[PDB]
Amino acid sequence: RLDELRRIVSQLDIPVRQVMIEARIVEANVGYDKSLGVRWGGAYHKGNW
């Protein structure tokens, strides 16, 4: 029994396993906004849009 336990003990005497986890976040945002106000104002003939 002592020997069997010793063999298992040998298996157990294992270093805790560390892992380095590198998860990377990549965010890309591309933005285009165009607004056009087209304006014709004349008050002489009262024409204005």
Next chain:
Amino acid sequence: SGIGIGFITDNIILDLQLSAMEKTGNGEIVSQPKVVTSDKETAKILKG
């Protein structure tokens, strides 16, 4: 925006206008999130 002015002022001031507006707006948003999940397990992507 939309005013069509006819004016008389010299003889009399008589103003006759047809004022019309047409507005058109289209917005389309297409968003696709991809999630890697274990089988029979929940995984969640949340972008907000």
